Amino acid sequence: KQKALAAALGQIEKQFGKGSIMRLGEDRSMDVETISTGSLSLDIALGAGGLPMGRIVEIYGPESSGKTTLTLQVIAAAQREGKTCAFIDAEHALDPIYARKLGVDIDNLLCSQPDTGEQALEICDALARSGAVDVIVVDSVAALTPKAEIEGEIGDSHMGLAARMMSQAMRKLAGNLKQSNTLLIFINQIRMKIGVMFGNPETTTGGNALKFYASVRLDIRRIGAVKEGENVVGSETRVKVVKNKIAAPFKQAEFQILYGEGINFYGELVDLGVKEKLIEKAGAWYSYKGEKIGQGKANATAWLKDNPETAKEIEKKVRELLLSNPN
Ligand SMILES: [Mg+2]
């Protein structure tokens, strides 16, 4: 029933919204402004090219999973486009040196270290309503301690309280964020071993409000080392888009996060370029449009870095080629 399907689906989307259902292989994505994640493969996995403005995103992972790099890259990206970013901190772990290396303009990064998780939430909401901040990164859900636990009343349970606190703010936050067309990223981790666990064993802190309100949920984890010699220079990273309401979910990205430098964007370009046959890897040389760009992924990368113009041309056809847009 191909036609009946379409009507059915259309019917369903009419009733529940666009993308309330879709074929995972479909080249559909919401027409949302987006900010790059810094990863080309992730921007692609996201389908729409980046994280969606006005939506709530959740990026969870272990410590040193790369979630920090990602969020920093996002801010960095956002700021490059002239967007105002706010960092709602409860983690107190911001590394401005590293952030600067990733291109975050720390000086202009709005920052806040709230007195309670509720206050943090209310500040996010406030910012949301203002429509003056474009990106809000909340670090992190697990660190957002409910005022009551802070006061020792901790009782009710921690899980209970946190979930309640999150559930109380989500709906409004989501709505205001949408109006101001403000992106709010919640950094989370998989909840503490009680439970046992259980359930899901991979359940993150905070309850279900975020789980269900998020337009995008990224499962990021370090899957290995990047070694230039016997010396480790970075983490081999895997980001799974476990939830995607702006394009089909479940696609994943793999890329390297190099210590001090950040995501290895050009490494990706090379790989995606090769995969999409834009880049030739045969013979003794990698080439683009028939010209030599380098010997081995390593040089190819470097080259792309020293030829941003060509690198941009490739990123562009890769996006045309891989982003989930109607074509
Ligand atoms: Mg060749």
Author numbering: 6 to 332
Reproduce text from the manuscript describing this model.
In all organisms, this is catalyzed in an adenosine triphosphate (ATP)-dependent manner by the RecA-family recombinases, including bacterial RecA and eukaryotic Rad51 and Dmc1, among which Escherichia coli (E. coli) RecA has been most thoroughly studied for decades ((5,6); see for reviews). The primary single-stranded DNA binding activates the ATP hydrolysis activity of RecA, as well as the ability to bind to double-stranded DNA in a sequence homology-independent manner (secondary DNA binding). RecA, consisting of 352 amino-acid residues, contains three domains: an N-terminal domain, a central core domain and a C-terminal domain. The central domain has two flexible loops, L1 (Gly-157 to Met-164) and L2 (Ile-195 or Gln-194 to Thr-209), which could not be modeled in the free RecA crystal structure determined by Steitz's group.
We solved the crystal structure of an inactive DNA-free form of RecA, in which we were able to trace both loops L1 and L2. The RecA helical filaments in the crystals had six protomers per turn, with a 72.1-Å helical pitch, suggesting that this crystallographic filament reflects an inactive state. The core and the C-terminal domains in each protomer of the inactive DNA-free RecA and those of the activated RecA–DNA complexes superimposed well (root-mean-square deviation of 1.03 Å for Cαs of residues 45–156, 165–194 and 210–328), but the orientations of the N-terminal domains and the conformations of loops L1 and L2 significantly differed. Unlike a number of previously reported crystals of RecA in the absence of DNA, our inactive RecA crystal provided an electron density map for most of both loops L1 and L2. While loop L1 in the inactive RecA is unfolded, in the activated RecA–DNA complexes it forms a short helix (αL1) followed by a turn and an extended segment. Asp-161 lies at the tip of loop L1. On the other hand, the spatial location of Asp-161 in the free RecA causes steric clash with and electrostatic repulsion to a complementary DNA strand that was located in the structure of the RecA-double-stranded DNA complex. Thus, the flexible loop L1 appears to cause a steric barrier to a complementary DNA strand. Our study revealed that RecA actively selects single-stranded DNA for the primary DNA binding and that Asp-161 in loop L1 plays a crucial role in this mechanism.
